[PDB]
Structures are given as C-alpha cells and as structure tokens.
Symmetry: D2
Subunit: 237 residues, 4 copies
Amino acid sequence: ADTIVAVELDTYPNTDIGDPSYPHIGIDIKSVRSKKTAKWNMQNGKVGTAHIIYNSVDKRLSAVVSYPNADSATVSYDVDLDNVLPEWVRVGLSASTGLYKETNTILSWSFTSKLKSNSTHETNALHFMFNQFSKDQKDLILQGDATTGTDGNLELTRVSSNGSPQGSSVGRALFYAPVHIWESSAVVASFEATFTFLIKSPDSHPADGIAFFISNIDSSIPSGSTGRLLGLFPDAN
Amino acid sequence: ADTIVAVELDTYPNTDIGDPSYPHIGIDIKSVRSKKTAKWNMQNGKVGTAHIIYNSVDKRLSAVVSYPNADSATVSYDVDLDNVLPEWVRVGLSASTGLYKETNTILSWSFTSKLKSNSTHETNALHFMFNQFSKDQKDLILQGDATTGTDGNLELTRVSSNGSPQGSSVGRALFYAPVHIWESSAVVASFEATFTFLIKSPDSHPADGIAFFISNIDSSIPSGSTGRLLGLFPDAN
Amino acid sequence: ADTIVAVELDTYPNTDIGDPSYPHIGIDIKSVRSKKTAKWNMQNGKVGTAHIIYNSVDKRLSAVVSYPNADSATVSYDVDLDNVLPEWVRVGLSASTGLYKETNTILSWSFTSKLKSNSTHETNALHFMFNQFSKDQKDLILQGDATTGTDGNLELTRVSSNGSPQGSSVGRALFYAPVHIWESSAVVASFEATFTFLIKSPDSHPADGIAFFISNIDSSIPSGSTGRLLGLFPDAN
Amino acid sequence: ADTIVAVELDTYPNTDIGDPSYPHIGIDIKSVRSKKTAKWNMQNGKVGTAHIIYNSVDKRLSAVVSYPNADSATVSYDVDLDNVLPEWVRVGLSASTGLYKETNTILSWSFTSKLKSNSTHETNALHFMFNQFSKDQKDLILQGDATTGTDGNLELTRVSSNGSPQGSSVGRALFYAPVHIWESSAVVASFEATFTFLIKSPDSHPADGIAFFISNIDSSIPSGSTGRLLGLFPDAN
Ligand SMILES: CCN(CC)c1ccc2c(c1)Oc1cc(N(CC)CC)ccc1C2c1ccccc1C(=O)OCCOCCOCCn1cc(CO[C@H]2O[C@H](CO)[C@@H](O)[C@H](O)[C@@H]2O)nn1
Ligand SMILES: CCN(CC)c1ccc2c(c1)Oc1cc(N(CC)CC)ccc1C2c1ccccc1C(=O)OCCOCCOCCn1cc(CO[C@H]2O[C@H](CO)[C@@H](O)[C@H](O)[C@@H]2O)nn1
Ligand SMILES: CCN(CC)c1ccc2c(c1)Oc1cc(N(CC)CC)ccc1C2c1ccccc1C(=O)OCCOCCOCCn1cc(CO[C@H]2O[C@H](CO)[C@@H](O)[C@H](O)[C@@H]2O)nn1
Ligand SMILES: CCN(CC)c1ccc2c(c1)Oc1cc(N(CC)CC)ccc1C2c1ccccc1C(=O)OCCOCCOCCn1cc(CO[C@H]2O[C@H](CO)[C@@H](O)[C@H](O)[C@@H]2O)nn1
Ligand SMILES: [Ca+2]
Ligand SMILES: [Ca+2]
Ligand SMILES: [Ca+2]
Ligand SMILES: [Ca+2]
Ligand SMILES: [Mn+2]
Ligand SMILES: [Mn+2]
Ligand SMILES: [Mn+2]
Ligand SMILES: [Mn+2]
C-alpha cells in the first residue's frame, strides 16, 4: 500500500466520497477524502498556477491556485509530515479522467526542498525546474498515460491526435531522485512546489483533476485509480 | 517613529516591561512587549543559528533558534504583515547592551524574498548571503556601534581591543537595497532569513540580545534605545 | 570620469567611430569603441533575450543575444576585470536614441554574483530578479528618461503616451545595492546577467541600442551621451 | 564502454602513463591521460575545495582547486561537450587507491546545471547540495567501496574502523537523477560543481586521487580501475 500526501485540484464533484458540490482544491493525507478543501473557480481552457508549501516549524501544508486577474483559492492543513511520510519520498504530478474528461496539460513544474540538520546546522537541498518538457525526459519516471514533449508539454492523461481528451485515463510524472523530506535531526525542513497547468474540455463537464503528490519512493498508480481516485489511491476510503 | 517587525533573542528579562523571567525568543509587532515568546536557553560562548520564515498564504511569522545538539526554541505568531508593514521595507539585524553586556557577533547572514504577482503570475526575488563580512561592506548600512571586518565578522555592539563587550551600546546592520515585502496583486509573497551568532559575556547575566527586523525604509536607531529596547523601539509601550 | 564595462546591443552603425556596418553586439571596456563585436540581426518589434557571463578563472566576458527560432549572436572578450573595475560596482541597464529612435523596453532583468574567498573558502552571493517592474520600483536607481511601471515594463528611453519613441533620449536603471564583483582573496568570482528587451521603431534605421553595464558605484549619465554613446561614455574616444 | 569527462585531483604521479612528475589537477576527456594539467600542491590532512565550471558559449571546461591561505591551482581546456557527451549524463565523484593510499573523504558536494532553450527561451535547471551525508543516502548511487554517514561524510574508498586508508580500493557516488547537460536548441547551457575533500595518508607518496566526473547514465566502475585509473577508465589509453 502506498503512502500518499497530496494537493488535489479536483475539477469534478464526487459528493458520494465527500467532495463538496463544486470544483475545489484539497489537502489529502492518505485518503482521497480531503482533510481540508476550498472552493475553486476552475477556468476551462485557461492556464493557471499552483503553489504548495510546507515547513517543519509550523508543520502546515498549504497551497494556492490562481489564474491571472482572478481571486486565488487557498487551503491549509496542520499536519506533521514526519508522522505521515517515510524519511525518503518521491515527488510527482498525477491526473485522471473517468466517464467525464479534460486534458491535463502541465506547462512547467518546479520543486525546492531544504533540510537543515541539528547536529551540524548544515543544509542539504534539492531544486529542479522544468519550463519545458522534451520527448525523452530521462529525469522523470512516466507512469500510465503520461507522455512528454508534445509541444514541449507534459500531458498527464491521453490526448488524441485532434487535441481532444480521453476518458478513463490516468498518468503521473515523478522526479527521478528520491527527496529527503525530513530527518530526525533537522532544525527546519521545508519545501515548495510550483506548477502551471492547462485544463480544457469540450464537454460542459470536465473531470477529474491533477494533483501534486509526495509518496513512498517505490510508488505506482494503484490498480483502477482512474476517475475520482486521481491516480493516487487504491480506493475511496 | 519607525514601524518595526522583529524576532528577538532576548538574553535579559526585564519583567517590569513584561518579559518572561528567563532568556526567551519573541515575536515583536510594533512593540518591544512581544506578541508571543518562548523559553530560550542562550549558551554563553557558543555559536548558534536562527531561522525566520513567513509567507502571505498562512500569514504566520515563525522562528527557530538553536545550538548544535540542543533542543531548539521555536516561536510563532499569526499576523498579516500586509496590514502592518509598508509595501517597501529594509531588513536588518540589531543588538544592544545596557548596564549588563555581551558581544553580539554575527558570523553569517542570509535572506531571500519572493513575490509572485496575480496579474501576470510572474515572480520577483531578492537573495543575499553573507558568510563573512569585510571591513568595507558597501552593501550594508551600519548604524550606531555596528562594525564589520573584525575576523571577518559583524559586531553589532561595541567590543574593546582585548575582546571584551561594552555596556550601553547599540548597533544595527541593514541590507542596503529596499525590499519589496508584499504587493497588492501578489498570489504568494514569502521570505526567509538565517543568521549565525555568538553571544559571549564575562557577566553572570549577559544583556540584552540580538534581533532580526523588518522596518520602514528610512528606519534608524531610536534615541535612548540601548539595553532592553534592543535598538528597535523608542519606549517600552 | 566613470569606468564602464558594458555589453552593447547596438542597433545603429556609427562607422565614423569604429562601429561595423550592420547592427551588432559588442563588448566595451572603458570605451564605446568595442574591443570585440559580432553581427546582430535585430528584429524590429520582437522580444529578444540577452545573457552576460563572466568568471575570474577564465577571465572571459561573453554575451549571447537571440530571438526565438533565430541563430544567436555571440561575442566574447578576454579581460581580467580585477584590472579594470573597482572592487565594488553597480550593475545597470542603459539605452539611448539620437536623431533616429526606438523604444528600449526591458521586460525582465536578472543578475547573480557569487564570490568564494581564499582565506576561509566561504562564499558571498547577491541575486536579484525582476520579471515585472512596478510604478515605484524602489530597488532601482532611475537616471535620465528611464521610467518603470508602464505595462509592468521598464522603458529606458522616452515614449510618448501614443506609444511612440522619441529621439535625443537617454535613460538607465541601476540596481540599488553596490555589488562586490571581485575580492583580492577570492578563489573564484562569477556573475551572470539576463534581460529580455523589446526594440520597436517606425524608422527605417532604428537607433541607438541598449546596454548591460557595470560601473563605479557613483556612476551617472555623462553629459551629452544620447545617441551613439548609449548613456555610458563622455565622448567617442 | 563508458564516455567520461572528468576533472581529476591526481595525488600520485604515474609517469609511464603520461602524468607529470608532481601531484597535479587535470582535465580528462575520455582518456586518463589529461588533455591539460597544472601542478597541484596537495596538502596531506587539510580540507581543500574544488570548483569546476563550463558553459556552452565559451565552451571551456575549467577547474580551481585550493586550500585556505594557499595559491590555488587552476586548469582549463577548450572542448565542446555537445560533441563529446550524450545529451543525458549522470554526474559524480570517484576516487581510488592502489599500492599507495589515502582517505578520499568528501565533506560536501554541490552541483547546478541550467539549459536555456532557443525555441522558447525558457530554462530547465537542476541543483543539489550536500553539506552532510547520511548513512542511507537514497539520492546517491554508491558504486564499489564508497560509503556515507561515517561522521556525516562520504568516504569514496575504504578506510578501516581505525581511521587508516586501504590500498587497492575504488568507490564512486553518482547523483540519482540524470542531468540534461545539453540540448540542440539551447541558447546557453552551463554547469558548476563544488566539493570539499580531505585527503589524509600514512604514506610518503599518497595515491591515487579524486575526480568529479560526467558520464553516460548507466556508467559503472570499469574492471580493475583501481590505482592510477581512478575508477574512471578501463585502460590507460
Ligand atoms: C455528479 C453527477 N451524478 C450524481 C447525481 C452522477 C451520477 C451518476 C452518473 C453520472 C453522474 O454520470 C454518468 C455519466 C456517464 N457517461 C457516459 C459513460 C458520461 C456522460 C455514465 C453514467 C453516469 C452516471 C451513472 C448513472 C447510472 C448508473 C451508473 C452511473 C455511474 O456513473 O457509474 C459509474 C460510477 O458509479 C456509480 C456510483 O455513483 C456515484 C454518483 N456518481 C457517478 C458519477 C460518475 O462517476 C464516474 O465519472 C467520474 C468523472 O469522470 C469519476 O470521478 C468516477 O470515478 C467515475 O468514473 N458521478 N457521481
Ligand atoms: C533584574 C534585576 N533588577 C530588578 C530587581 C535590577 C534592579 C536594579 C538594578 C539592577 C537589576 O541591576 C543593576 C546593575 C548595575 N550594574 C552596574 C552598571 C551591572 C552590575 C547597576 C545598577 C543596577 C540596578 C540599579 C540599582 C539601583 C538603582 C538603579 C539601578 C538601575 O538599573 O538604573 C538604571 C535604570 O533603572 C530603571 C530600570 O528599573 C527596572 C529594574 N531593573 C533595572 C535593571 C538594569 O537595567 C539596565 O540594564 C539592563 C541590562 O543591560 C537593560 O535591559 C536596561 O535598559 C538598563 O540599561 N534591570 N531591572
Ligand atoms: C559637420 C557639419 N555639421 C555642423 C556644421 C553638421 C551638423 C549637423 C548634422 C550634420 C553635420 O550632418 C548630419 C548628417 C546626417 N546624415 C544622415 C544619417 C548623413 C547625411 C544627419 C544629420 C546631420 C546633422 C544633424 C542635423 C540636424 C539635427 C541633428 C543632426 C545630427 O544628429 O548630427 C550629428 C553630427 O553628424 C555629422 C556626422 O555624422 C555623420 C553621419 N551621421 C550623422 C548621423 C546623425 O547622428 C545622430 O543620430 C544618430 C542615430 O540615432 C546617433 O548615433 C548620433 O549620436 C546622433 O545623435 N548619423 N550618421
Ligand atoms: C614489471 C615487473 N613486475 C611483474 C613481475 C612487477 C610487479 C609488481 C611491482 C613492480 C613490478 O614494480 C613495482 C615498482 C614500484 N616502485 C616504487 C614506486 C618503483 C620501484 C612499486 C611497486 C611495484 C610493484 C608492486 C608491488 C607490490 C604490490 C603492487 C605492486 C604494483 O602495483 O605494481 C604495479 C606495476 O608496477 C610495475 C610498473 O611500475 C611502474 C613504477 N611504479 C609502480 C608503482 C605502484 O603502482 C601501483 O600503485 C600506484 C599508487 O597507488 C597506482 O597508481 C598504480 O595503479 C598501482 O596500483 N608506481 N610506480
Ligand atoms: Ca472529485
Ligand atoms: Ca529583555
Ligand atoms: Ca552605434
Ligand atoms: Ca596518477
Ligand atoms: Mn475532492
Ligand atoms: Mn523580551
Ligand atoms: Mn557599436
Ligand atoms: Mn594524472
């Protein structure tokens, strides 16, 4: 069983699993059933930006999702990540479609992690930035339907050759290196992730979402995690 | 009068102006009477580290102070800094001694500030890092008794040639450029500051401490602000 | 008398003072008569990118200027800046027009400087990034006709309210803090500068160009330096 | 066979394979016989620093190795890495011993690589920093004898529990993620690596040295590459 901590941008309300009745962002700790949610005015066909941040002093995971000239959506949850995640993790982007669909296009993605130790007071750090993705992107582990390099973008779910999204699709990109996301003797450990995304559907009703996640390093897409499970979780519990 | 936000490392309790009875760290919002404090076991003669963080999403100002292999002191305070500080500020370090005294040596100092705006979703950033200081540190504004370049360090308060700290002293160092700390159309604004410091005293009670601070751009040491007022405040209100 | 090292993007050939016969980029060392030039195919009304790099092992000053899908222009020159510049400098952007004109619009400007010292092997750093400019950009020193905040851009030279550039104009923007560009006891010093620019003109001959520049700190626009002198030199010697 | 680009810190002169008659630094392009070398006064039992840099514009690989308060050794060589390395590489540190020996202790290692592409003018970047190494260091592929976590250091070759180095030992540590060190449509690509090291020995001629290297991603320690081959090269050609 994978251990997953995620920020979801959920375009599709599954109220039978506790989604609120509108598109929303959410903080998920080991369950697709978010611990905290906020209303999110998703705009179909427009480029937005997400930002996720955490530090071990406040022990607060927070995210803001925004479109230019619009009010942002923000959500926050108090959680000690060293009580949840293993010491080493991978970081990644997940998306999915079900019986409804949307393109789940990533235009850019960056991540910074820092860990300062208490025995020495010295820092380890990891930064990456993709402002474009190439066809053979060897520092990403591409899972399920994820492909890269079409127009320099990362397409987490299937897009047909005429530009339309496909239903029942699930794809992830994980950064190739493990990340040391906490250490018992860190005075302060932090991270921040940013990604710009383009969710478009010719349907009145898009689905299902894109999430930023942190997992056990050996994580894979759970069996049948298309749809509301966002490529993250083996079931709806 | 100046507008000051600060994290203080207060080595000397002045309980007649509301300090805790022990050496403490504190978050000071336009007053020397800290909005929040925590017990801090200052170690006479050991090099310690301080980290200060804040972001516009959680609107939480937090600091950790620690020495190698000791429990850290942490203090935090919910505060929207866009309601407190002008849009443009200077950042700095300050220290004083009074009738009791200590060296207030800075061995390094770094700072990072970022603003991502909401009309363009583009980010401005300022980073600086000092891991030694030179005799002529042209990018620092020294006030009061502050000097640099003695052993490559920043001495915030006055030290004799035989290395002994002096009483009734006060000294500040500000980074030279104004810093854009918030902006009305920013999706996320954040900063982080680190410094390493060395407080040594021949007295049984060292006084008075060291602060990291954020101020109006034209800020200067208030008249009479040696001792308990830390070079930051004009009175004890 | 100022000391200027500059990379010029020279849009107007003044062959009577050594310019090649075509738009060109150049490295200037204390003279507007370039020590080295490369052919530059400036594209009217297109947003381009310029990159400037130097380090104190190579002692080589190099620049690349390009537009999306074109061949870049590159120019490199061998010079120890230890011998040319003072130890503390300001970095800047400058631009001018004379009888002929162009908008000299900067859309982004970044700069990183790093110094690692010989006695301690410790490391000082300055980084700034502007991806937009506001109306009151307090960490810029604005000289001559330079203004910021028009469309979130920096217009180095005078533009009418109707969008039209003006002749006989000169402007500059310097970063506010002095920069420690070399230190006698450095194992390696380096810097990198990036800006993006937009040069539009109604004229068959656009004039005069834009420059990234490094100067004595107290530098100012030399009297008469519009047009060919690019806001940098007192004369064409 | 592997494709290797290295900067070597060669503490033992093997004059039969073309080493000069002293300890030296060298640039190795797919052969252990350096394309350029400089004399290097290795100091037995002192912590030194090495900095290596390159960019695609000058196309010059350069390195400085230094001890506090000593003259640095520097070496440089004009080489287009486009023409030598594949598009994706791994980066690492290698060391060896042979009949003579020495501890090959890494106390810190940093690396930064950037690509600006010419179709879009956007950058992809990778940065990593270790100031401490932990026992189970997941983002490093340790090959051969290399180990981590002893006093928070990376020991490239075998050292006994009593501090003494061992002969005929070879060990490498590779960062986990492949690095995109060039791309055909890049306006500029560059990198930088820094490491600090402690070579200590009971012998009068310590051996064999330490290298920072770049390789094909599936590179491993070639057969019998102890001693003078520095864990890099399958033979002396
Ligand atoms: C929120 C709107 N609601 C609640 C009142 C709703 C309810 C039922 C359907 C809904 C929608 O939509 C469809 C659409 C289709 N389409 C053709 C394949 C799309 C036009 C087929 C069946 C249904 C059904 C349906 C009707 C009869 C029998 C079975 C079902 C039906 O959807 O069966 C599969 C889902 O199982 C039923 C559990 O009911 C929960 C309520 N429901 C179902 C759905 C659609 O879910 C599917 O798509 C989602 C979006 O891609 C994914 O998050 C999810 O993982 C799954 O792939 N949402 N709400
Ligand atoms: C916390 C201990 N308490 C409260 C019961 C205390 C009270 C009085 C003194 C205290 C301590 O200490 C000294 C120390 C000295 N020294 C010689 C310079 C150092 C041994 C001289 C006079 C006093 C006096 C003293 C005795 C008789 C007449 C007047 C005074 C005396 O301190 O007069 C100066 C100001 O007195 C008003 C403050 O009254 C609050 C009680 N108090 C006084 C102090 C000493 O504060 C001075 O130094 C501090 C440490 O650097 C600063 O934070 C502060 O701004 C100031 O510079 N702290 N608590
Ligand atoms: C030497 C004889 N005298 C004084 C007795 C003289 C006086 C004025 C001119 C003179 C000559 O010649 C020209 C020639 C031109 N030409 C067209 C480019 C050459 C036919 C244009 C304006 C003037 C002028 C002129 C007339 C009216 C108003 C202004 C000027 C005027 O700008 O004059 C500068 C002196 O230029 C004479 C020699 O330059 C040779 C050809 N030249 C001139 C120019 C115009 O340059 C102006 O624009 C350039 C492009 O932005 C700048 O790089 C430059 O810094 C300056 O701001 N380019 N190429
Ligand atoms: C060619 C005749 N034969 C075969 C029967 C032969 C065999 C062994 C040796 C031979 C010769 O010569 C020497 C010479 C030395 N010398 C002191 C430097 C020269 C007198 C040291 C060890 C050996 C050895 C030797 C003795 C015991 C154990 C091993 C060897 C041993 O490793 O010998 C390797 C081949 O040595 C013959 C070529 O000699 C060139 C001069 N020499 C030898 C060495 C030591 O090299 C070793 O260490 C260096 C430093 O760690 C590494 O760079 C290097 O890759 C290797 O691990 N340096 N300079
Ligand atoms: Ca959902
Ligand atoms: Ca106090
Ligand atoms: Ca010209
Ligand atoms: Ca050798
Ligand atoms: Mn949800
Ligand atoms: Mn206090
Ligand atoms: Mn020119
Ligand atoms: Mn060699």
